C-alpha cells in the first residue's frame, strides 16, 4: 500500500517512538545523573568522534548529490559543523565537554582511546551515505525530526564547559517515495541510523557500565588525562 | 620509534596476537570451556555465520586491487577455499550448516535479518578497510591467520549432533619486504590491531546482548525465532 505524504511521516516518525537512543538505559542514566565521572568521561571521548565524522558523512553524500540546487542546501551542514576557523562550528562545543572532563586536547583529537564499536558505527554510516540510492541517505538524516545535551546534573562539570552548550529531508523523501518499495526503503534506512545511535551506546554500557569489560585500545581511567 | 628489522616485526606482530587476538575474549572463553547454554551458542552460530559469509567478499576486494596477475594467483586461492568448487563445498557451508545444527532455518541465517547491528558493522567495516587503506595494511589485516579449534569446542555440547561436527605465508612476507619506513611498519601493526579490533568487538556485542547484562538491541534474534 503507497502511503500518503501524512502516514509516511507517521511511519517515520513512529521508528523514532520506538528506536530513537533517548531510550536507550545508557542515555537514560546520562539523562538522569546516574553516570560515574569515568562514564561520562567514556561517553564524552565518543561521541566527540560520532560528532567529528559527521561534517565527513555530509561531504560523502555531499559528493554524490545529482546537481547545484541540491549541493547548495546540503553543504549548509558541512559549513554549520566546521565553521569559519579554528574554535568555530560546533564540533567546538563537543571538544569542549572532553576537556570539561579532564582530557588532553590532543587525546581527544588522536581519537586514540574510543571504542571501535563507535568508529565501525561511523564507517558503517558514511558507507551507507555514499553506496545507498540517494533517497536512504538522504533519510537516514531524519533522526533530525526527534531534535538537551544533561550535563548540569554532574557537579565536575564547570559552567564554562556550559557556555559552549549556550524541512528538507522530510520534503524530499515525501516527494521522491513514489512507490511502496522506496516508502520500506526510506523507513529501513531511518531504521538503520538508529542502529548506528544504539549501537554506540551499546558499547559505552557493555565497557564501561556492565559488566564493564573494556576493549583492549579503548580509553582507561586515568588515561590522556590532565 | 625506529625502523624494525624484519625479525623485530615479526615479533612484533606477533606480539599482537598473544594480547589481542580473540581467544582472550570472555566470551570465548566460555564457549570453550563449555559454559554458554543451546541459546548462547545460537546467536554466536548466527553472528558469527555473517563474519565468514563476508570474508570472500572482503578477499574479493583485495583481489580487486592487487597490481597484477601473479598476485591475484596466489591470494584467488582463499576465494576458492571459502566458497568452494559446487554448492554445498566451501567453508561457508560448515557455518551454514551449524547454524542449521542448532536448529536455524536455511532462509533465516542467509537473511541475516537476526544478527547484531555491532555484528554487521564491525564485519562491514573489514571489508571497507581492505578496499580503502593501503595495499600493505589490507594485506597485513590478514596476519590473524599466523595465530589460527572450533571442531573441539563444539565437543562440549550435548546438542551439537555428530552429523553438524564432521562438517568441521604470503602475508607475513609481503609485509617484511614492504613495511620498509616507520610510518609503514606502524600501519601494518595497526592493521592487524583492526583485524583483532573487528573480531573483539563483535565477541563484546554477543556478550552484552546474549551473557550479561543480556540486553538484545531492537532487532536481533531472540530465542525461539527462526527455528
Given at each position: 500500500?503507497?502511503?500518503?505524504?501524512?502516514?509516511?511521516?507517521?511511519?517515520l516518525?513512529?521508528?523514532?517512538?520506538r528506536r530513537?537512543?533517548?531510550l536507550?538505559?545508557?542515555?537514560?542514566?546520562l539523562?538522569?545523573?546516574?553516570?560515574s565521572?569515568?562514564?561520562?568521561?567514556?561517553?564524552?571521548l565518543?561521541?566527540?568522534?560520532?560528532?567529528?565524522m559527521?561534517?565527513?558523512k555530509?561531504?560523502?553524500?555531499?559528493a554524490?548529490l545529482?546537481?547545484?540546487?541540491?549541493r547548495?542546501?546540503?553543504?549548509?551542514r558541512?559549513?554549520?559543523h566546521?565553521?569559519?576557523?579554528?574554535?568555530?562550528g560546533?564540533?567546538?562545543?563537543?571538544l569542549?565537554?572532553a576537556?570539561?572532563?579532564g582530557?588532553t586536547?590532543?587525546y581527544?583529537?588522536?581519537?586514540?582511546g574510543?571504542?571501535?564499536?563507535?568508529?565501525?558505527?561511523?564507517?558503517?554510516?558514511?558507507?551507507f551515505?555514499?553506496?545507498r540510492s540517494?533517497?536512504?541517505?538522504?533519510?537516514?538524516?531524519?533522526?533530525?525530526?526527534f531534535?538537551v545535551?544533561?550535563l548540569?546534573?554532574y557537579?565536575?562539570?564547570?559552567?564554562d564547559?556550559?557556555?559552549?552548550?549556550?524541512?528538507?529531508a522530510?520534503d524530499y523523501?515525501?516527494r521522491?517515495?513514489?512507490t511502496?518499495?522506496m516508502?520500506?526503503?526510506?523507513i529501513?534506512?531511518l531504521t538503520?541510523?538508529?542502529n548506528v545511535?544504539?549501537?554506540?551506546?551499546?558499547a559505552?554500557?557493555?565497557?564501561?557500565?556492565?559488566?564493564?569489560?573494556v576493549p583492549?585500545?579503548?580509553?582507561?581511567?586515568?588515561?590522556?588525562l590532565?
Amino acid at each position: 500500500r503507497l502511503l500518503s505524504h501524512e502516514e509516511l511521516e507517521a511511519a517515520l516518525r513512529d521508528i523514532g517512538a520506538r528506536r530513537y537512543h533517548n531510550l536507550h538505559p545508557f542515555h537514560r542514566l546520562l539523562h538522569d545523573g546516574k553516570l560515574s565521572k569515568d562514564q561520562v568521561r567514556a561517553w564524552a571521548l565518543n561521541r566527540y568522534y560520532y560528532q567529528a565524522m559527521i561534517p565527513v558523512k555530509d561531504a560523502a553524500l555531499l559528493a554524490r548529490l545529482p546537481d547545484a540546487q541540491l549541493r547548495r542546501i546540503w553543504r549548509q551542514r558541512i559549513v554549520d559543523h566546521d565553521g569559519d576557523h579554528e574554535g568555530d562550528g560546533g564540533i567546538e562545543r563537543w571538544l569542549k565537554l572532553a576537556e570539561g572532563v579532564g582530557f588532553t586536547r590532543d587525546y581527544v583529537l588522536s581519537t586514540k582511546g574510543i571504542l571501535s564499536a563507535t568508529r565501525f558505527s561511523v564507517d558503517a554510516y558514511v558507507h551507507f551515505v555514499s553506496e545507498r540510492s540517494l533517497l536512504e541517505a538522504i533519510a537516514s538524516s531524519l533522526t533530525e525530526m526527534f531534535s538537551v545535551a544533561m550535563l548540569k546534573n554532574y557537579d565536575f562539570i564547570t559552567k564554562d564547559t556550559l557556555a559552549y552548550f549556550d524541512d528538507f529531508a522530510l520534503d524530499y523523501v515525501k516527494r521522491h517515495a513514489t512507490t511502496p518499495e522506496m516508502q520500506r526503503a526510506a523507513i529501513d534506512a531511518l531504521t538503520f541510523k538508529c542502529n548506528v545511535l544504539w549501537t554506540q551506546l551499546d558499547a559505552l554500557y557493555f565497557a564501561y557500565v556492565a559488566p564493564g569489560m573494556v576493549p583492549p585500545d579503548a580509553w582507561q581511567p586515568g588515561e590522556g588525562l590532565v
